[PDB]
């Protein structure tokens, strides 16, 4: 879905949306995402990157390029090998071979729950495919095609959903608005969002170039 996201971003950016801007008319409540990353912890110098999704499921992308996901029921597990092969297990019944990884996941889970703010908390299955950080942002690519970009300095966030051709923007006051990209082309948007969308295009290009 990355190339579709790139085309959607090309189209909106080429329309020069910030140049009468009628940004409010580009909002679409029907396009609100189901999943996004609400918390994350970068322990990649030792273990990997842990994260919580907005449904309270947690996942780790380990340094050996495997993934373990704990469902929000707190017992059901999905393990994804490097090849991409999925296995389904539980904490109550797992092979000894995954003990190390499960214990690491539980520690990440407990820490995030206790210590980090839940992004998009005021709003009512995929795993982390890859991620990277720049000086400005962390970029999270989910297995359902969604791409999330969290900007460090001002705490603003984009969630890009190529299947809906939509983008959710969480601003500095933590207001959460979801826009149809084609409506941003039609009605325009503020310079702030337009700038973030230009950055997003460059980030999606990075994902595509490092496949």
């Amino acid at each position: 879905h990355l190339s579709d996201m790139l085309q959607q971003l090309h189209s909106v950016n080429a329309s020069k949306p910030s140049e009468l801007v009628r940004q409010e008319e580009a909002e679409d409540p029907a396009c609100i995402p189901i999943f996004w990353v609400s918390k994350w912890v970068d322990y990649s110098d030792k273990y990997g990157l842990g994260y919580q999704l907005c449904d309270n499921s947690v996942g780790v992308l380990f340094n050996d390029s495997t993934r373990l996901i704990l469902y929000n029921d707190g017992d059901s597990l999905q393990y994804i090998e490097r090849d991409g092969t999925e296995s389904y297990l539980t904490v109550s019944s797992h092979p000894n071979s995954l003990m190390k990884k499960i214990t690491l996941l539980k520690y990440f889970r407990n820490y995030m729950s206790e210590h980090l703010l839940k992004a998009g908390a005021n709003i009512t299955l995929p795993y982390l495919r890859t991620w990277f950080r720049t000086r400005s942002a962390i970029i999270l690519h989910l297995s359902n095609g969604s791409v999330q970009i969290n900007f460090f300095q001002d705490h603003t966030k984009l969630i890009l959903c190529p299947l809906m051709a939509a983008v959710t923007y969480i601003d500095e006051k933590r207001d959460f608005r979801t826009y149809r990209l084609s409506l941003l082309e039609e009605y325009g948007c503020c310079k702030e969002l337009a700038s973030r969308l230009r950055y997003a295009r460059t980030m999606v290009d990075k994902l595509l170039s490092s496949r």
Partner: peptide, 5 residues
């Protein structure tokens, strides 16, 4: 590093 505290 961590997400927002």
């Amino acid at each position: 590093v961590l997400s927002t505290l």
